[PDB]
Amino acid sequence: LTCVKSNSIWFPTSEDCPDGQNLCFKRWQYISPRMYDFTRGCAATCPKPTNVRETIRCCGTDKCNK
């Protein structure tokens, strides 16, 4: 699998996931209206929110987390 990788520093790029990681994730954290922190990458299992302002979506096709 290949996923989009991005975070607060790095602009979105393609990344090849390690063998055995067959999900891509997109995670967003609400700050205020229409203002979010986004993170994207590969995962083995879908990550879970660390706080109630976070939402995560996972998917299983190349770069589906764009």
Residue numbers in the entry: 1 to 66
What text appears in the publication on this structure?
The three-finger toxin (3FT) family is widely represented as structural motif, mainly in the Elapidae snake venoms, supporting various biological functions. This fold is characterized by three adjacent loops rich in β-pleated sheets emerging from a small globular core containing four invariant disulfide bridges. Despite high primary structure identity, often greater than 55%, muscarinic and adrenergic toxins exhibit distinct pharmacological profiles and clear functional differences. “Loop grafting” has been used to construct seven chimeric toxins to dissect how the affinity, selectivity and functionality for the muscarinic and adrenergic receptors depend on shuffling loops between various toxins.
Three chimeras were obtained by substituting loops of the MT7 toxin with the corresponding loop from the MT1. These chimeras were named MT7-1/1, MT7-1/2 and MT7-1/3, numbered for the respective grafted MT1 loop. The comparison of loop 3 from each of the two molecules in the asymmetric unit of MT7-1/3 compared to MT1 shows again an excellent match. The comparison of loop 2 from chain A of MT7-1/3 with loop 2 of MT1 shows that the replacement of loop 3 of MT7 for that of MT1 imposes a reorientation of the side chains to match that of MT1 although there is poor sequence identity. The situation with loop 3 is different because of the conserved interaction between loop 2 and the second strand of loop 3. To preserve the interaction we have observed that the side chain orientations on the top part of loop 2 tend to conform to those from the parent toxin. Indeed, in chimera MT7-1/3 the side chains on loop 2 execute a concerted rotation and adopt conformers that match closely those on MT1 loop 2. By least-squares fit we have an rmsd for MT1 vs MT7-1/3 of 2.87±0.08 Å while by SSM the value falls to an rmsd of 0.89 Å on 61 aligned residues with a 79% sequence identity. While loop 1 transfer has no significant effect on the toxin affinity for hM4, a moderate gain of function (5-fold) is observed with the grafting of loop 3. Notably, a two orders of magnitude increase in affinity for the α1A-adrenoceptor is achieved for chimeras MT7-1/1 and MT7-1/3 by the grafting of loop 1 or 3.
